[PDB]
Ligand binder design. Structure first.
Ligand SMILES: NC(=O)C1=CN([C@@H]2O[C@H](COP(=O)(O)OP(=O)(O)OC[C@H]3O[C@@H](n4cnc5c(N)ncnc54)[C@H](OP(=O)(O)O)[C@@H]3O)[C@@H](O)[C@H]2O)C=CC1
Ligand SMILES: NC(=O)C1=CN([C@@H]2O[C@H](COP(=O)(O)OP(=O)(O)OC[C@H]3O[C@@H](n4cnc5c(N)ncnc54)[C@H](OP(=O)(O)O)[C@@H]3O)[C@@H](O)[C@H]2O)C=CC1
Lengths: 298, 299
């Protein structure tokens, strides 16, 4: 089983590197910075358990997906279309593309562009690029995938490599739950450059999160999404279990990078407007992140 | 007539400075930073028409309001109560207290604490403290005041000093119009540190402003306020007449000072909540300015 990782960043390197450690044939399609370090001394895979250098192929040409039976597509939502179109010509016709991304539109976007079988996955992991060719795993690293033609074979192969997997007939719901969590925290954290535990103690913040969340639940209902039963409590409890954590969006803005805000609060805005559902709290958070992003850019 | 300016900052020094320049006995209750500058070289009153050093009395003791017939109360809303109680025992009983402030609760707050006649005023000016003891008037400088027992005599005295004044039976609506304008621009400008003309080009910003304003207009209606007829259009046009202007709230956050946000979007939140009217856009803007302020103070 040949595996290609399109967009070998924090997520791609962990899952890709774990499969390489298990003995599969894996090639990471990464940026020159990382390709140069992977070809020099291999992929440094630093886990909460072990720390190793892993011999994997790496390339910056999206055609290196050639011959892969399974492509883990791990770019950010903002790059879904460009990355998919870059790899489309070389992609095997029988290849299974897994979307290891956050957001609710990636699988649909991929299927609109590609004839190959696509399956959405929900990624539960904490990872970062510690430097060139270096991935650092802070915690978790499991997956929930839609049903694929590979069946239980796909989950058996991941478990055998050190990444547990569960097939679900409601990946839509899991992806939306994660989206609403991100709508509640990411923009607030990014705009103020404060961690979740500091954030929730500001005056009015619990009531802002209520407003944001009720807007999202209204959109999820209109969209026929079945969310977990205690989703609101689970969201509120994140400030307690990750008190010193700042959001990915916060880290993007601190570093002058473009965030995924168009696929977080922006999605709720676009969707709410299309459905006649007021989304004012979500709209202020989206507009504010984009204004800050645009100042940094110009 | 004897006049005291309580909270001689940008507004207090301009209006007080014109009166002192016109021959009135004016005393400025300012912070020490300024008091030492005035006691040294006098108040510098720079307009786009002239530049002058004006001999005025200044002090930091709020008891200096003693024996004033007219008190111009020009502190930020955050300080109305503390400043009002500071000057309360010293204040002449027949003194007229004019609130030259922004917000819609100052005159009521003052009347709750003081027995003296209080009149709300709407301040139309652009003024800054260019440095210690130095007031820079950028434009306008007229007042619209509620009716007073002093009647037309009050407006005739101000006009004589180069300060145009009108009396209105709807200062309420004028104060609310200014509030809604500030609810639309101040927090956005402060959170992002961008001027009005840059802000309004952002993706989704016109729609945020619509949302903020509609919440404000809903609260204003439930409160029985009569606003000017084209208030929405006048607010949107500010982005084109002051394209390079950042808000007073932006300048406060840039300098690590506490803003008046509890009396801008915070008033709308508190009132909307009390009236059962959703105020989500305003609530986000208020919470965020407060979070940023709190970080700059402790952490
Ligand atoms: N990081 C985490 O712990 C979590 C992440 N997620 C989600 O998983 C997804 C990926 O996240 P993450 O790994 O952190 O993001 P990263 O940016 O770290 O990884 C993606 C990488 O793909 C690269 N890339 C984009 N286009 C191309 C291209 N055409 N050719 C080659 N490389 C390309 C990017 O380059 P460049 O650097 O220039 O953009 C980047 O290095 C996101 O949707 C994210 O929200 C979900 C759960 C956990
Ligand atoms: N500036 C402008 O162009 C205009 C302002 N306004 C409104 O008018 C009001 C006044 O604003 P502005 O003049 O700009 O604000 P300023 O901060 O410049 O002026 C207030 C001054 O009073 C001082 N003060 C506060 N408490 C006391 C006290 N206990 N004893 C002595 N001094 C005290 C303040 O000290 P400290 O510096 O420590 O806070 C400050 O120096 C506001 O409500 C504002 O929104 C309306 C239209 C235009």
């Amino acid at each position: 089983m040949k595996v290609a990782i399109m967009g070998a960043g924090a997520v791609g390197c962990y899952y890709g590197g774990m499969l390489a450690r298990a003995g599969h044939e894996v090639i990471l399609i990464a940026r020159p910075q990382h390709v140069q370090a992977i070809e020099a001394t291999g992929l440094r895979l630093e886990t909460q358990s072990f720390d190793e250098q892993v011999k994997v192929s790496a390339s910056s040409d999206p055609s290196a997906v050639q011959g892969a039976d399974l492509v883990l597509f791990c770019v950010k939502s903002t790059d879904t279309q460009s990355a998919a179109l870059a790899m489309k010509p070389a992609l095997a016709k029988s290849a299974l593309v897994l979307s290891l991304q956050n957001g609710v539109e990636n699988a649909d976007t991929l299927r609109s562009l590609l004839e190959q079988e696509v399956a959405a996955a929900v990624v539960y992991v904490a990872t970062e690029m510690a430097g060139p060719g270096h991935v650092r795993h802070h915690g978790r690293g499991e997956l929930v995938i839609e049903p694929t033609s590979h069946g239980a074979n796909l989950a058996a192969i991941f478990a055998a490599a050190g990444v547990p997997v569960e097939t679900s007939d409601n990946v839509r719901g899991a992806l939306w739950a994660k989206l609403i969590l991100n709508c509640a925290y990411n923009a607030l954290s990014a705009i103020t450059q404060l961690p979740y535990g500091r954030l929730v103690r500001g005056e009015g913040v619990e009531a802002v999160m209520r407003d944001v969340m009720e807007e999202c639940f209204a959109v999820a209902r209109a969209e026929g999404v079945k969310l977990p039963d205690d989703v609101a409590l689970a969201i509120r409890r994140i400030a307690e279990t990750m008190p010193r954590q700042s959001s990915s969006t916060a880290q993007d803005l601190a570093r002058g990078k473009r965030s995924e805000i168009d696929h977080l609060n922006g999605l709720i805005v676009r969707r709410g407007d299309a459905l006649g559902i007021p989304v004012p709290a979500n709209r202020v958070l989206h507009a504010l992140v984009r204004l800050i992003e645009d100042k940094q850019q110009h």
